[PDB]
Structure formats: C-alpha cells, structure tokens
Amino acid sequence: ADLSSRVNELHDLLNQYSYEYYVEDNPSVPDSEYDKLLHELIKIEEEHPEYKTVDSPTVRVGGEAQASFNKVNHDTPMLSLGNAFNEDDLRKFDQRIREQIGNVEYMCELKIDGLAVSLKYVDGYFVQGLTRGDGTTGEDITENLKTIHAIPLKMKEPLNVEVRGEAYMPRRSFLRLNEEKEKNDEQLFANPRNAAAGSLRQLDSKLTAKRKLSVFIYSVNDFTDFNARSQSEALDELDKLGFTTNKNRARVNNIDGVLEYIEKWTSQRESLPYDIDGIVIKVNDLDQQDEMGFTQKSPRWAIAYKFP
Ligand SMILES: Clc1cncc(-c2nc[nH]n2)n1
C-alpha cells in the first residue's frame, strides 16, 4: 500500500516531539501522544517494512543488531586536557596564553561527568559512535548510542564530521533506576556515570533504549565546513546543525570572568540535573587556539578545572 503520506507525517511529528522532549526540555504534546504515534509507526514498519529507514524514529527503541564493540580508530584522536585545581593554576594558564598571543576571550563550559564519545557523521547521517578509549582507539557502541534521542540520526546539513561529546545519565533517572534495583535486591550503581557505562556496555540496544541517557556535544574534529570563527560560534553552529549542546556555557573576556564562572558553578552545580566533575576553559578564537598549539600531551589553549 502507498503509506508514504502517513509515514512521512509520523516521521515529522515524532522527530518534532523527540526534539522537544529530549533536546529542548519543552514538550508540546503529552507522552501518551508520542507513545501512540511511535506505536503506529512501529506497526506500519512491521506490516510494511519497505517504509523502514536508517533514521526512522523507531531506531530509538533499539533493535536486534548488536554493537560490535570492535576496536576502531577515531578519524581524529580525542584531546587530553591538562587539569587545574585552584585559582593560581588558572592564573598560570591565563598568563602563559597572554604572554604568547595577547589578550584572549575564553569559553567556559561545564565538564560533564560522562562517558566521552565520538560520533561520526557521513553525508549528515550518524554512522559510527565510539567510546573515547585511549583517545586514539575506542570501542564501537554505535547501535547503543543510536537509542539516545539527544544524538541526532541526521543533521541539518549533509556534513562529514566527527563530533565529540559526553554521554550521561541524568541524575534523577540514575536515582530512580537505583530505587528499582533496590526493590529487586540488585547491586545499586555507584553513580550516574557508572550507570551510563553499564547501559552503553549492554550487548542489547533495547536495554540501552529504556535507560534514560543523553549527550552534550562540545566539539568537532574538523572545522572545514563550519562558518564558526570561535568555540562559542561553533557550539551555536552545532545547535543549528541539530546537535545537543550545553546551554550553561559562557564567553568571558578575561580570567576574572573565568573565576567568576567557576565560583558560580561551584554553588549551582548541586542544582543541575546531571553530575559534572569540572569546568573546561578554552581560548575562544579558533585561530588563537591554532596559534597556541599543543604540548606533547595537551592543548596549551584549554584546561580542565577540577572540583574538589
Ligand atoms: Cl577538547 C575537550 C576535551 N574534553 C572535554 C571538553 C569539553 N567538555 C565540555 N566542553 N569542552 N573539551
């Protein structure tokens, strides 16, 4: 039967609703509506499997295909950040930069206590999701990562990029998960990060699907097809491309602003719906980052402040 009108309409609505619920946290429709439409599409695809697509909303429920866990090199190795533990560390960081390249703007972001991941897009389609591993070689968990609504299955523009993000379990879902384990005398997860790890390490993407995971994307391997001239522009651009980014980022003019940001988030981190382990500070301008270069191990243009 030619079901293309209804299939397309279901794709449109479920994509809208998923984005509203999981990326914006702003539903327009009750869960009963989402569930109803998803169920209808699932039945359409069961009875008319020619309508299945690689980026169908039904992908989010997981499938029979198992994540290979194969060792796979990232297109581009993921960076390792140096750490800061106090103000003096940050003043040193700032001083090294300003002595070499002049005064800079800084991008400040929350360091999500998650599983670092790389998400590879080809022609705008999500085609590979790897754990960070050793920074060069990770494990292929693509099939599990596809169940996370916050990871777009298809971007707004058909780019070939490898984005970098942190996958995580929101705290309240972690806690309610542990309530469920307590009721069934199971060993509780130690924390949200361990729960996210356990969930992504399943062989069964259908289990991963029912766990409440999300992501925040913080960079990309290659800026060639980005118009961004800065990290802050780049994140805005990722937003416009369809990715999930952290809205608590801020551009600050100087190291005083950086300290202010850390002072703010030290007090407010308690109220966030996910765990963070620090604050990442980057020279904002992309050309300036390039100018600062890398040590043998780490960017000279970025630092991870770690909470006590
Ligand atoms: Cl380059 C890098 C490495 N690890 C984390 C981050 C990050 N995390 C949040 N924003 N940026 N960036």
Swiss-Prot record:
At the top level of its lineage, which domain of life is listed? Bacteria
Catalytic residues?
A: K111
Q: Which GO terms describe its biological process?
A: DNA repair; DNA replication
List the keywords (alphabetical).
Answer: DNA damage, DNA repair, DNA replication, Ligase, Magnesium, Manganese, Metal-binding, NAD, Zinc
Give me the residues that bind NAD(+), please.
D31, S32, E33, Y34, D35, S80, L81, E109, R132, E166, K282, K306
Q: Which GO terms describe its cellular component?
A: cytosol
What one GO molecular function would you report for this record? metal ion binding
Function according to Swiss-Prot or TrEMBL:
DNA ligase that catalyzes the formation of phosphodiester linkages between 5'-phosphoryl and 3'-hydroxyl groups in double-stranded DNA using NAD as a coenzyme and as the energy source for the reaction. It is essential for DNA replication and repair of damaged DNA.
Say which family it is in. Answer: Belongs to the NAD-dependent DNA ligase family. LigA subfamily.
Mind telling me what this protein is named? DNA ligase
Give the source species.
Staphylococcus aureus
